[PDB]
C-alpha cells in the first residue's frame with residue numbers, strides 16, 4: 293500500500309513522518325474536458341497563471357485527465373501551427389519545508405520533458421522532483437537519444453524576474469544516471485526539502501544526491517531580500533517560500549530551437565512521432581507528501 297511504503301528520508305530524533313491528505317493516488321475517473329469534483333478538490337488543470345508554457349508548448353486544460361488508476365497527460369500538434377498542446381496541473385494547496393514529496397511516475401518515450409516540480413507563487417524559487425527527457429530515439433535530430441533516456445535531471449532554480457535571470461547548479465551530479473532507461477517502468481522520485489539550504493533527492497527509496505549550503509543553493513545572492521544579485525551584501529533567504537506542486541510535460545526552447553542552430557541538436561517530436569499516443573503520454577500513479585512530527 294502506497295501510504296505504508298517507508299519514507300527514505302530521516303524525520304529526525306523522536307520524529308515520525310505524517311501523511312498529508314493533499315497526497316493523491318488518482319483512483320477516481322476525471323474526464324479530460326470535465327474533470328469533476330474529486331480532481332478539482334486538490335488540483336487545477338492549468339499552470340498557476342495564464343502563461344501557456346515555454347518553447348513550442350501550449351498548455352491546455354483538456355490535455356490532462358485521470359483514468360485507470362493514473363493521472364495522465366498527452367501531447368497533440370496544435371492545428372495549423374508548430375505548437376504542441378499538452379497538459380499541466382497545479383496543486384490547490386501549497387507546501388513548505390520541512391516536507392518529503394514523492395511521485396511514482398513513468399517518464400515518456402518522447403523528446404518532450406516529463407516534469408514534477410515545486411514553484412513559489414511569485415516564480416522566484418523552484419525545486420525539481422522529476423525532470424526527464426525519456427525517448428529511446430529522436431527523429432527530429434536523426435539520432436539515438438540514450439544520452440537523455442538514461443538521465444534524470446535533479447535540480448532547483450532561483451530567479452530574478454525583471455530583468456530575467458536564472459540560476460541552477462550545473463555540476464555533473466545534477467543529472468543522475470545508473471544504467472536504467474527511465475521510460476520502461478514506473479519509478480519513485482522524491483525530494484526531502486528540509487530547510488531553505490538543504491535538499492536531498494531520492495530515487496526508488498535511495499538517497500542519490502544531497503544539495504546543501506549557500507555556495508550551491510544561491511551563490512549569486514538572487515535570494516537577497518535587498519538588492520538581488522549583489523554578492524557584497526548578504527540578506528539571502530534560500531529556498532524559503534511556500535510552493536505550488538506542478539505536474540506537466542513541456543517542449544523547451546533549448547531543445548526545439550537549440551543555440552547551435554543545428555538540426556542534429558534539435559530534439560522535439562515530429563508529426564510521425566506524435567502519431568504514437570502512448571509514447572507521448574506521461575502517467576503518474578501517485579504523489580505522496582509527508583511532514584515530520586514529534587512522536
Ligand SMILES: OC[C@H]1O[C@@H](O)[C@H](O)[C@@H](O[C@@H]2O[C@H]3CO[C@@H]([C@@H]2O)[C@@H]3O[C@@H]2O[C@H](CO)[C@H](O)[C@H](O[C@@H]3O[C@H]4CO[C@@H]([C@@H]3O)[C@@H]4O[C@@H]3O[C@H](CO)[C@H](O)[C@H](O[C@@H]4O[C@H]5CO[C@@H]([C@@H]4O)[C@@H]5O[C@@H]4O[C@H](CO)[C@H](O)[C@H](O[C@@H]5O[C@H]6CO[C@@H]([C@@H]5O)[C@@H]6O)[C@H]4O)[C@H]3O)[C@H]2O)[C@H]1O
Nearest residue numbers: 341342343346407408409415418423439445449542544546
Ligand atoms: O548525445 C547528446 C549529448 O551529448 C552530451 O555531450 C551533452 O552534454 C548532452 O547535452 C547536455 O544536456 C544537459 C547536460 O549538459 C548540457 C548538455 O547540452 C545540459 O544542461 C541543460 O542545458 C540547458 C542550458 O542551455 C538547460 O537550461 C537545462 O536546464 C533546464 O533548465 C530548466 C528548464 O528545464 C529544466 C532543465 O534543467 C529546468 O528547470 C525547470 O523545469 C520546469 C519544468 O519541469 C520549467 O521549465 C521551469 O522553467 C521556469 O518555469 C517558470 C519559473 O521561471 C520561468 C522558467 O521558464 C517560468 O515562469 C514563467 O516565465 C514566463 C516568461 O517566460 C512568464 O514570466 C510567466 O509569468 C507570467 O507571464 C504573464 C501571464 O501571467 C503573468 C505572469 O507574470 C503575466 O501577465 C512565468 O510564470 C524550469 O526552471 C540544463 O540542465 C547531450 O546533448
Ligand code: NA
Nearest residue numbers: 317318361577
Ligand atoms: Na494510482
